[PDB]
Amino acid sequence: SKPGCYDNGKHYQINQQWERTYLGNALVCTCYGGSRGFNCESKPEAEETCFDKYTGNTYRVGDTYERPKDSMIWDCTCIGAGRGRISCTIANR
Amino acid sequence: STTEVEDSKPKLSIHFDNEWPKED
């Protein structure tokens, strides 16, 4: 046993951080060495975008679109705020 | 006009834990 938190893939120094993806999101982990394991945290991307699973189309952070839903029509807007969220609002015309 | 906001992926924190591959 050698002092050095080893990740499920590569070994890094004590309290060292590294970029690793989980299922589909890139989270940077912070090893602790030992039974403390390592904690991952969502990393800040560069191509912030907003995807609409309602029409299967993609938009960029700071864009808007009009799509119907539930016998109605929602003017969903694409946001980001250093993250990447999708705000959906109603707008029956 | 009725706001809703279903968000997307507000941050993400895991806690992967695994022992060392040794002691056979």
TrEMBL record, chain B:
This is Fibronectin binding protein. It comes from Streptococcus dysgalactiae. The chain holds residues 1043 to 1066 of 1117 of the full protein.
